[PDB]
Amino acid sequence: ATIHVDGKEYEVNGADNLLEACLSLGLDIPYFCWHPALGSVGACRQCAVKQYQNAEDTRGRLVMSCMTPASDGTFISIDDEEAKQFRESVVEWLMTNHPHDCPVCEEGGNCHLQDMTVMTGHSFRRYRFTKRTHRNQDLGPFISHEMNRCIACYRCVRYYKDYAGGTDLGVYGAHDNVYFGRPEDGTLESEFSGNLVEICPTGVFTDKTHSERYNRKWDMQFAPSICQQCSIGCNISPGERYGELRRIENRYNGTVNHYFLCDRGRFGYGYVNLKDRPRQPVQRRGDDFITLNAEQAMQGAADILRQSKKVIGIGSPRASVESNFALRELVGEENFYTGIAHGEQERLQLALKVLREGGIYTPALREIESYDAVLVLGEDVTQTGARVALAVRQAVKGKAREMAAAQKVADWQIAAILNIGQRAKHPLFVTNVDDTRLDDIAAWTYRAPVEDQARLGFAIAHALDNSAPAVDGIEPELQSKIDVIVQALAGAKKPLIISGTNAGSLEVIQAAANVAKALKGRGADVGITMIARSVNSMGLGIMGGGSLEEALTELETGRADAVVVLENDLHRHASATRVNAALAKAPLVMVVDHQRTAIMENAHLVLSAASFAESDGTVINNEGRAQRFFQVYDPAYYDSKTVMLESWRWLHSLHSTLLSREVDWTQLDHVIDAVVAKIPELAGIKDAAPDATFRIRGQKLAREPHRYSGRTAMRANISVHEPRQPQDIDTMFTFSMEGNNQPTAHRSQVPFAWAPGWNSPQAWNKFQDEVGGKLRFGDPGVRLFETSENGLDYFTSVPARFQPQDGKWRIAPYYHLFGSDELSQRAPVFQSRMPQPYIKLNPADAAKLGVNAGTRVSFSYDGNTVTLPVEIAEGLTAGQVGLPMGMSGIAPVLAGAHLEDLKEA
Amino acid sequence: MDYTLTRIPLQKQEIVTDPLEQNVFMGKLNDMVNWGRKNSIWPYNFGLSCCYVEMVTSFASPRQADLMVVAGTCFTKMAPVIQRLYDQMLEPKWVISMGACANSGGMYDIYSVVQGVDKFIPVDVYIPGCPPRPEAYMQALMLLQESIGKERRPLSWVVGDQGVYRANMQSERERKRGERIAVTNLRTPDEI
């Protein structure tokens, strides 16, 4: 369409809002209640402009930019007298009752209300009466809440109810005494409550974890990185101050993770600033530990490796592609073992085969929301990686969206869409062992063991296409439910099949592939996605290697006398006693890691590897795209004794000193050249971010804002003589303020969102070609996969029905969000949020055991009789006991494993 | 108190004890030498940018002055002149750094400014702040006078230790801590 703003012609979209069309042109209209991902309401009246119909008009009408469609022939005006003074009156009405507590506010220089108060140009106060005050609420360990700062813009409840689907927060109040929160005091049980810090334009909902050890936004040294907590790989902006990581911000990327993070990735950054982390190369000699620098530690490690006869490199899914390849080059290629179990590696390889050889397009996180039906097989999506679950919520709301669009109403007014919808949902069929958080909006939920979920998928694939292998023994009511599922999926334009390796069985992945092939064979636009376990598990599968059990057999047999374990706990992927015995039998154990694990004891050398806040690396998504994360700070800037070098740097220098007896501190793009010249499947990772010699208009990119404070007194407590800024040869980023963070810069990766006059998280709209859409000049990361021309075959192996037995108990995975990751559970803030280690029993199983809820029972695994209190689960089945995977002492390998001796303690 | 010594910015200094804690003739003679160096001090006010009028209005051939006042900003083109004039002087020599420009970078953290005089020559006495008052300079003269009054320098180059001894004096901020913290009220800035 063609509009005229300020007596000037512009060409904008026709079906979008006028506010987003004007913001996509770079013009400045203040707003409080409109969000690009939440639609438009009238909770404020801040976006007021003056509209004229004809080309020439005198009076016009004061309209809202977020309520006016950007149609052909509108002549609106922004900086006239009346609209500007009306917006000044609206910000005056917002400052009518606002507390005078800006310097003691967690927003401060990150506050949208300050930016829009300054932008409207209101400084003189004419209000002389009393203000409005409210009490406070305890909203858990993550969201600090205080109601005085609010302006009643209704964005929090709009996100939390319509978008996030949470059933906790809401509006309780009246004309002026309007309250936003919880009817009681308690933790917000939604997994997306951490996005309220950036959704709220005021300091009502703030980061409690950042409130403790707080610094302002301009003091934050930011970096563009990837969240390492699970496989969704949401683009994040970690920001540090005084040598510790302080705040993770949402980093905009229009392909994956546009506006919202999950709670785990938002609040699981407390492990990188732990005080028990390995910060020095520590080698134990005799019975006491000595501390070395990098040089003599590398020399000694290379001498012991030269004196050894065979080296085993045990990688990890938590490590980067560059670090795992550096290990793969340090040890021989024929002996390099992936740090996962045999069943886990089989599930990962089958998932990769489905991804890159099934011939079915795998959707990204943004385009999951555009699909017409969702079938989730055996995956706790809301608890493993919750961003796909949020996208599934949006895809469910897509039916109400399209039904509203059929009534010729606009798509940016979410109130009319939810008016027309009225609990009209796309078909969502979730299968899990127990109840999920998606059951509120699901068309159907199937509570069954993993084999029964796989058989349900096989029945769905057989009903969709007769070429699939048939499964017998289906009950007529279950057959009717299969008929309902397949007539919902056959009538869907773009069906979606979601699975994962966290189900604990190959047959669920096989059933998901069979259903996707059956949907593709009849001409549907089916997509399939698999949620992997760790952040770079799929990259480890692409690179490949032996399983952990093969390496343990090699260590126990004695064929290798030297083992190098890279960033792996080794207890989550195998049994603890066998791993401890194999590592004790090895004459040389080197552990390259950044976290104090249980294998550092009786380990001959410990290399202080760098975490994602202190290292550069490449991680591969669950979708299949390869993104890369950058360093946030130099660990040697403060406490210069520590080195904390990158894992790939450590292993490559070890390899170079093994060969030529010389230490080489190489560069990251050399390792990228190595991985694209050695592995043809990883040849595409040199397209996510460019070379380190990439300078737009001659200069680098800044980690920190232009108002970085205290540069001559930050390190003055130990030395007044200011040290040189840390020179970064690995990346295209300088560690200090003299870079470039201009929104109109030809780049794909942005450290942080800051524009002149836009100091809020709502400053990301200046970095996009259209606001709420894709990022300008492309998106970070490249796909690395193509849809295959010819798919796989139908998987004939249909599993049998799960028949319970009295002596043997089947372990059912649960995967709690705040407790199914080692890196998450090492954070001190998750301990008050994570539930206590429990076990789950059927009512019939609890009756046959004679125990009640809350009573300790003892179960024996690996010769250890460990005791846990029970919980009665209605959705669980007989013969199964439920366990939270990833716990302390409960490895995720046990998912699908058997259990014995369920006796009361 | 403890003492640091320099014996023959990259030099080495470690902590020792004075040799007078052990010849009572040498103790009186060294005290008289320190007294003579204390009450007779000739400064060399270095010509630089804009602490000149603070050393002009406070009240001079080189190589006879044992005290050098580095006042202005230390630039990349002027620093070799500072080093040459410093090596022109003869030991014993002491340095007073006037203003922030000589203590540190002094509001100029830019490419053409050397971050303090400490980068090439040692500095004995510092005066902080953009242009210091001449009374601050005169108080620094007291500070360096008492610092000179407590040293242990060799009398001759024939017999004795060939290393000058600097005194690890108590800092002025801890000595004045009681008088500075114990300030209750101040005059409001709305009057004169």
Place this chain on the structure above:
Amino acid sequence: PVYLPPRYRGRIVLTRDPDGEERCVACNLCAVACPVGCISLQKAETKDGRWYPEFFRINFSRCIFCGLCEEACPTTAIQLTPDFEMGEYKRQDLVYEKEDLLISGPGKYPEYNFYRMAGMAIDGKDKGEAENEAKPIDVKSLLP
């Protein structure tokens, strides 16, 4: 002794309120208004209420006594005394820590307290007990 006017930019101090606590609320306005960049501090929070600076270091070898920090303080905490009798033997001991700046009384602004204007919950100051703030009317109250 030399007479100096009250509006003299000499030695920099922190200030206490008439209540007796430290009136600095550990924001970062003075650290970022500094053209030199010689103020460093980190916020800590009391178990009941108010913010205080965990540390507060000023590099006086770098400061030029320009006065932007006092002008930028919304609590009138950082102030410029007329004291100018400074000078240290070492550059390392020109960095004044928290104990070297916080004085035991209100300085050039005797009867100002920020926390009587702020809206947060403070020990000895409930909600609505601040200046020009009404008592918090309950949401569940019977009043229409």
Place this chain on the structure above:
Amino acid sequence: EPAWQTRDHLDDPVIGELRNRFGPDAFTVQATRTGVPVVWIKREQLLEVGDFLKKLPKPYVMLFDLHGMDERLRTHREGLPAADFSVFYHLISIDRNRDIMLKVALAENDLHVPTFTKLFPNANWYERETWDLFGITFDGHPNLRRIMMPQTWKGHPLRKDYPARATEFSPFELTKAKQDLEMEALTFKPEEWGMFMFLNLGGAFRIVLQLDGEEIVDCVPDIGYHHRGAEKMGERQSWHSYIPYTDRIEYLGGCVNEMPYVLAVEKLAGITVPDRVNVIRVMLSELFRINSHLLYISTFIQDVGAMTPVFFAFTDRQKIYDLVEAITGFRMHPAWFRIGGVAHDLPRGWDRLLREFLDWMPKRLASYEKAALQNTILKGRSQGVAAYGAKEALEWGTTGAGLRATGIDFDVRKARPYSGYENFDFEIPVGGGVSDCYTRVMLKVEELRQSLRILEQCLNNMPEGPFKADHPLTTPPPKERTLQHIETLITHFLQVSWGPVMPANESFQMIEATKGINSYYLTSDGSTMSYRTRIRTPSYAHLQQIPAAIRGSLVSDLIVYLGSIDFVMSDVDR
């Protein structure tokens, strides 16, 4: 229409003459808030454009400024030619009492401009400074070398990709430069400098001297020894944080030095300050002008009489320093000019101090006139040598007392008034004929008298309005409303911390400084910092013309001329 309105000056007669001469095309008029018609010129026709300007009926006989500009990171370039670099030439026509800006466009791959020194001889040091700070080469320019940075410099400082920090101070570079300083006098090469015996005679700066016996034949002074980098830090600091850096340009001026930056920032924001702010600005500027004039007259009269030349001047400078200490913070650099006003209000004792000052100075002025008339030996000695008149002071810059000593009645306070100087009645004194070393100090004595009369008029009727404007962009806002109003706290919080967000325009403020004409030309890219700060200082043009008058003089004559010129080396190097 306000004075900060974004005009294009299409009604200026010079624009119509350019249209009639070179057609409607071939130049692009830019609309800016500078108050100056800015036209963009292609590279080829710059010489003929200037040559046409040289023989206008009321010609542009003075090149006020000449400097480069890195346009590679300017995002708000609307209505402007596509140029990666731009060289701006600020020209002033005294007869028209107008001024124009001539911006030659440039691409990145060819940073070559034809030289401008054949038309205006003061363009030599400006083009050398452009080749220093930027990477712009000038074709046909003699001795094109590094003037401010040392010759062993790798990059260009003012270019946008140059890091504006001090590097790691390796002592190897210091020892190497000391070794270059060791043999620069014995192994001197008279081909790099663009030059009988050669020596280096040691503000503080050195000048290379060539002598036929004792007679000076050639002299190219070496400057850049006080380069603080004011403009590059102007690209680094915010609008509010640059005020101390504006103080530290020249040390005698101070408050006069922060007047043009504050007024240009107010032009960029669009702030119209009230009457009391203008009167306070005039008062403090004339106080510091009195300080600088007293220092110059004291250092010019000391060398002959020396009976009481410093004690007679010490009381006046100390009492005005106490007055500045009462009004502002410390004495030399007030840092007291804020955006839209001043940092604080005047106390309840400034009337007594100013009245005690003003009734005690007239007999000092009579004594100064008596002392400047008593020593007739200096009057017969310094009146003969090196007296330029009416043409050398108009082509070499020379904005100070030399311009008014040559008879050219051009003062900024009367031609282009600023900060409410129209309300003060003061008669600008001018010389006659040549710019002698005695006419300059006589004009500075009469300027002291005029400044005293201005201060008397300020003390007579003082406005009782506000000391800060009511604009929302006045940084900082008033302190009491900051402490007890939420909205004022918002404005103070965002203007102090991030910086005042300012509209993307260009402004130019030109004032009469204490030793000439100072000017701040500020380009804003819409951000909270300055995209470009250009500081045109009078001492640069005053020092550039000393080879044109010591051409056949003696060394003592050169020292006398250096003493009689009011240049400051840190003001030269910014």
Place this chain on the structure above:
Amino acid sequence: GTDFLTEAHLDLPMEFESIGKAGSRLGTALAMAVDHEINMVSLVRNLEEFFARESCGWCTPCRDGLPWSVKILRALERGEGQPGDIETLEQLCRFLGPGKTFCAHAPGAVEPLQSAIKYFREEFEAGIKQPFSNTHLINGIQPNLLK
């Protein structure tokens, strides 16, 4: 919900269009009479109190302007009116018209303010006694008293 009319408008026929051109509207056509014994300051204060406490909390201008009108009218009733209240009320009622707010509660709320400001201006002018006082002194900072 409608706005006041004086005695000169009593001859108008109570229609929609007939009262429309008189700067008014018919509404529910149930008329209400105000006598000289009732001050319109208290009456319009009660009307604005009803509209402020019976509005919803959705959109900003009504939400934070009807309590402001309530407090201004309370100050005028209690004799504590200040310079900057009548113009504030008329700017409020100009900015609370149709289209500026989300619904039509606010134009009907501020229409009695329109008529009371237009006709009985002298009572609101007599309600202002004390001068403007929004800020108090700090006795360490010179105030920015503009003249």
